[PDB]
Write a protein that binds this ligand. Structure first.
Ligand SMILES: Nc1ncnc2c1ncn2[C@@H]1O[C@H](COP(=O)(O)OP(=O)(O)O)[C@@H](O)[C@H]1O
Ligand SMILES: [Mg+2]
Length: 336
């Protein structure tokens, strides 16, 4: 009818072994079945989809993000975030070779698709797309489009949904504008960072696409937020090196158990993704793993996080906006 309940989608992507791993006695320990199951230590883990090391960027996008883009275009909130220990393949998955047609990742592909669609519709559909690009490090938000603001606050919008107050919101009209924006952010992130390899492994990168469209015929306004997240490393020290990752794990556990209380507040990361996790949003998590034997423990660890998240259910619905005028017309036609 109106709204529907849906599970969080969880895709597991293994990457091929790197030079480093090959040089040691590292052996490929992932055994594949069908295309939804992977075996590690004579144990099966079934997901919505399992991607082998040979799976191309393009394949991942089609099986994972293309659908999200379609929902967002329909007025749905969607989220996609990569999860896994450092070097498992999160950035490669979400970003890839930003401008390489064959090597680019989910984000740049989603950007092209959004505009391909728009350029297809008639003039009756008017889209207003603004983007934001910030990062969360040590529980503090920095705007990648304006690095001078380094500790932005999370507030609630008019519809009581979490949002980074005061973060840059660029209005874009073409893919190119979004790409330049993304290049601008990648670049500023280096400022005041004394070691990008370590920094990025320990920080959260969030790219937000706010899509608002209005139909002149139907007189309806739809709006959907699209979070594309490149989480910090899930590896442990005894416990998660990233407290924010401990939070994400607790939130995921609470939801998966059906507990009335969910610790979203433990970190602003989990507060920003509050709607993505248990709310009005179509979320897809891509857990990234190393097929390496040297990494077997972190992998099982990652596979479990995926198995829990998979059991969570959201109650989503299109996000329509009506004026008091439009609202009453319908109210009357219904109050009949
Ligand atoms: N699926 C993959 N296929 C080929 N190379 C990959 C794949 N995933 C990761 N890599 C490579 O592995 C290294 C780890 O990359 P990255 O995605 O940035 O890891 P993470 O973001 O999880 O720390 C990089 O050099 C990257 O290009
Ligand atoms: Mg990374």
């Amino acid at each position: 009818a109106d709204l529907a309940e849906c599970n969080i989608k969880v895709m597991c992507r293994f990457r091929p072994l790197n030079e480093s791993e090959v040089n040691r006695g590292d052996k490929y320990i992932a055994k594949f079945q069908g295309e939804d199951t992977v075996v590690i230590a004579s144990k099966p883990y079934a997901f919505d989809r399992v991607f082998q090391s040979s799976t191309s960027q393009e394949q991942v996008y089609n099986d994972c993000a293309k659908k999200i883009v379609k929902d967002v275009l329909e007025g749905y909130n969607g989220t996609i975030f990569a999860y896994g220990q450092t070097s498992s393949g999160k950035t490669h998955t979400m970003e890839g070779k930003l401008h390489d047609p064959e090597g680019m990742g989910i984000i740049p592909r989603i950007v092209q698709d959004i505009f391909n669609y728009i350029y297809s519709m008639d003039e009756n559909l008017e889209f207003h797309i603004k983007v934001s690009y910030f990062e969360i490090y040590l529980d503090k938000i920095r705007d990648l489009l304006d690095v001078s603001k380094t500790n932005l606050s999370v507030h609630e919008d008019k519809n009581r949904v979490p949002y980074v107050k005061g973060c840059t919101e660029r209005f874009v009209c073409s893919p190119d504008e979004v790409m330049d924006t993304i290049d601008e952010g990648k670049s500023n992130r280096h400022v005041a960072v004394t070691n990008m390899n370590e920094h990025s492994s320990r920080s959260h990168s969030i790219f937000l696409i706010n899509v608002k469209q209005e139909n002149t015929q139907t007189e309806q306004k739809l709006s959907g937020k699209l979070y594309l997240v490149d989480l910090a490393g899930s590896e442990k020290v005894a416990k998660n090196i990233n407290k924010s990752l401990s939070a994400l794990g607790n939130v995921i556990s609470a939801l998966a158990e059906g507990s009335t209380y969910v610790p979203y507040r433990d970190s602003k990361m989990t507060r920003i993704l509050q709607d993505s996790l248990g709310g009005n949003c179509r979320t897809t998590i891509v857990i990234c793993c190393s097929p390496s034997s040297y990494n077997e423990s972190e992998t099982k660890s990652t596979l479990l996080f995926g198995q829990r998240a998979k059991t969570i259910k959201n109650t989503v619905c299109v996000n329509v906006e009506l004026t008091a005028e439009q609202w009453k017309k319908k109210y009357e036609k219904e109050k009949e």
